[PDB]
A paper describes a structure:
To explore the catalytic capacity of nematode GS-like genes, the [name] representative of Clade 1 (Gpa-gss1), one representative from Clade 2 (Gpa-gss5) and a number from Clade 3 (Gpa-gss12, Gpa-gss17, Gpa-gss22, Gpa-gss24 and Gpa-[name]) were heterologously expressed in, and their proteins purified from, bacteria. Remarkably, each stage of the evolutionary process that gave rise to GS-like effectors has witnessed at least a 10-fold reduction in apparent glutathione synthetic rate, such that Clade 3 GS-like proteins have not retained canonical enzyme activity. In contrast, none of the Clade 3 GS-like effectors accepted any of the tested terminal amino acid substrates in combination with the γ-EC backbone. One possible explanation for this is that Clade 3 GS-like effectors represent a novel diversification at the site of the di-peptide acceptor. All six of these positions are substituted in Gpa-GSS22 and Gpa-[name], thus suggesting that the lack of canonical activity is because γ-EC is not accepted despite the potential for cysteine to be accommodated. Variability in the glutamate portion of the di-peptide binding pocket is ubiquitous in [name] Clade 3 GS: of the 24 GS-like effectors there are 21 different amino acid compositions in these 6 positions, not one of which is canonical. Coupled with the high degree of conservation in the ATP-binding pocket, the functioning ATP-grasp fold, and the perfect conservation of a catalytic residue, these data support the hypothesis that the loss of canonical glutathione synthetic activity is associated with a gain of non-canonical activity.
Glutathione, the tri-peptide γ-L-glutamyl-cysteinyl-glycine, is the main low molecular weight thiol antioxidant in both plant and animal cells, often present at millimolar concentrations in vivo. Cyst nematodes have exploited a series of gene gain events to redeploy glutathione synthetase-like enzymes during parasitism, within the syncytial feeding cell formed in the host root. The most recent expansion has been coupled with a diversification of structure and biochemical function that has given rise to enzymes that are introduced into the host cell, and likely possess novel substrate specificities.
Numbering used by the authors:
A (entry chain A): 34 to 68, 82 to 129, 142 to 148, 155 to 214, 218 to 315, 324 to 365, 372 to 387, 405 to 414, ...
B (entry chain B): 34 to 68, 82 to 129, 140 to 151, 155 to 214, 218 to 315, 324 to 365, 372 to 387, 401 to 414, ...
């Protein structure tokens, strides 16, 4: 069976492959801004092994997972019932929402010793790793291939996926002269290069020369206004904005209550609290929006509202072992409504090598991988109908048993 | 006709396109090590205009240009007769030849020069070999600028360059001529963070995808090479870590250097070529007969030469007093001629100063605002490689040609030609 130590154990060769991997990263956009310069993103040298069945189980449930959170997001009454500054803020001026999600998974060791797929988190909005993912995927196919080893390292085109979904959003807005807005926190934001890499894909999947305009949120106070008649969002008094691609406040809701397609609109932030994820583990709550429901139940982890088997988590800081009893007695009952109890997962431990900026590589570490599955929707929130499902994507992150980008090798 | 100002003159839009161009560079290896981190390479925002005929004239003469310097390099007595240079001769004299097969890659540089009618002619500024810059950077700038131009609606006028591939294809052919399946290719650098390092790595990314059997490329600094490289006393083959035979030593920038040079590894190129690429020699090739001797390819070469006279008094601004391997202009040329001691006379020559083509472009630099609507003078570099046997003087392989451009103010910037 594939495992990373049995590829190579000469330290001098592993060191030389570290420098090679790192120099490939520096040559292919696997970088971030620091200080302002660029630095490569920490990476595992080789792809970590991962069960084929569970990866397929995670990939297959993504369609269902988007549909559940999309439909929950179309039912504001439901979301409110499941739980204050966000509610205060929240007819609809743009029914069409673009909705991209990353579901995270851990292969978890049940008793018997066999691994089962269990979902760690769902994320939407200012999502990391659209641009980095297809590149790490290529990095690791190259390392593996260069060492002689071998469908077991599945293709990821997640930069393309994002591009194809933005293009479809632009088309649904239906204005040939309209632009796509990339809204960042700063010029050197940690999302900036992933954002730019999305546009490099958008260019090569169109004739149309779609203008993408990169603006910070500070400069947006002067350069974005809303039309008082159309309620359309305008840039520099001249350009209609078809899509606002949020890449990380009064302005934010002025944008949200306008005809531009949001990615996704603010209502989705309410449907992706950890409270809500915990609420979906209660009986009936998935079935309500729907088989896709059973597939979803298989990956859930029962979480109970208000000791080494459990974790006390906050719902939006967490306690393990005897600290759970310590915090339970200590805690005032006002705070009880902000935490929940879940079963602690026994995570799969594998061996790999870790390559970091300005340090020697760490060889033969125990690490636990975490699988992220990407998927996007284009849907209408007044009808609840979906018009577009994007291709799926997938990435991985390993931490010691601070993290590292990785990619799965399907054992 | 194409010119850069008539693309766009909104400063806010030019600024936004600067950041875009720069972020594309950071995403595609147009970077170097600094400080240790990475920084993007300064670039022109748009490709600078360049005459179609002269570019074709430069591309077409490259085959001839490699053949002349290759054949001059096969004739040690000729090179000696044409003359640090004392230190290089001393060495070559210690060495028969253990590896006849040389790999020979050249970059010839050109300026479009304004003759008196007002029309531009191609004139060669320099030839370079050995630790050559811009193998890896060139195809990427080429792609950068095709993208900027295309994204702005403008349009064979921006010719494809695969110079990373070119280098790879020539190393692969060198490895094959050595003929040992278990032999490695050595990349010799000055340091781990050398300015050539990422261009070197990018060559290997191309070498991987033009073969099935993974050729091992081993990256070593020259300091580490003192412990890890020895020569076999029987084969005279160069060995790495007592285990790996080295088929090709790819020099990317001293006793060790000539221990490597006098061994069976293919050099890139061997040290003799450093003697044939002095500026003295380039100046010697401008004298009558000296090109014709190795050869029409000769006339093509004569067209791009600039007469240079060894060691005026009416239009001294037409001339420059250059060093042959620091230079004097205008009335200083007459001043320094009389002043100068005859020891120094053998290290300088007189050439015609070229009146260079000035174009407008925008310059994008790290951590500053872009400089819009500068006058700049572009400089065209044509790449080509050989694989040849120096005992017979026969060539077995000619690589594809490549091309790059660099613009300076009328500090420099990577550019690419738009063929007006
Ligand atoms: Mg004068």
């Amino acid at each position: 069976q594939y495992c990373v130590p049995n590829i190579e154990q000469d330290p001098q060769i592993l060191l030389e492959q570290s420098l090679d991997a790192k120099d490939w990263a520096l040559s292919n956009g696997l970088v971030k801004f620091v200080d302002m310069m660029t630095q490569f993103l920490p990476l595992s040298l080789y792809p970590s092994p991962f069960p084929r069945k569970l990866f397929q189980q995670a990939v297959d449930v993504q369609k269902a997972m988007l549909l559940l959170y999309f439909r929950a997001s179309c039912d504001y009454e439901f979301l409110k019932e499941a739980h204050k500054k966000l509610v205060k803020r929240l007819g609809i001026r743009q029914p069409v929402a673009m909705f991209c999600q990353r579901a995270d998974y851990m292969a978890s060791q049940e008793d018997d010793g066999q691994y089962v797929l269990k979902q760690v988190e769902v994320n939407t909005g200012a999502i990391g790793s659209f641009g980095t993912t297809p590149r790490f995927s290529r990095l690791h196919r190259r390392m593996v291939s260069n060492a002689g080893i071998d469908s077991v390292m599945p293709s990821d085109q997640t930069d393309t996926m994002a591009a194809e979904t933005l293009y479809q959003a632009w088309l649904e807005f239906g204005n040939a002269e309209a632009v796509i807005l990339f809204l960042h926190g700063s010029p050197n934001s940690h999302l900036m290069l992933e954002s730019r890499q999305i546009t490099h894909q958008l260019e090569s999947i169109s004739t149309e020369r779609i203008k993408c305009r990169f603006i910070t949120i500070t400069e947006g106070l002067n350069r974005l206004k809303r039309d008082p008649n159309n309620f359309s969002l305008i840039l520099d008094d001249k350009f209609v904005v078809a899509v606002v691609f949020d890449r990380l406040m009064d302005l934010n809701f002025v944008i949200d209550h306008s005809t531009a397609i949001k990615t996704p609109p603010y209502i989705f932030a309410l449907s992706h609290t950890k409270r809500m994820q915990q609420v979906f583990t209660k009986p009936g709550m998935v079935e309500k929006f729907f088989h896709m429901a059973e597939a979803i139940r298989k990956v859930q982890t029962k979480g109970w509202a208000i000791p080494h088997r459990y974790v006390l988590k906050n719902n939006g800081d967490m306690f393990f072992n005897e600290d759970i009893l310590k915090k339970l007695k200590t805690m005032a009952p006002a705070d009880r409504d902000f935490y929940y109890l879940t079963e602690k997962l026994r995570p799969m431990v594998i061996k790999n090598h870790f390559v970091r900026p300005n340090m020697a590589p760490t060889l033969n570490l125990d690490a636990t991988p975490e699988l992220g599955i990407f998927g996007c929707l284009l849907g209408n929130m007044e009808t609840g109908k979906v018009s577009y499902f994007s291709r799926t994507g997938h990435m991985m992150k390993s931490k010691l048993a601070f993290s590292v980008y990785d990619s799965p090798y399907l054992v």
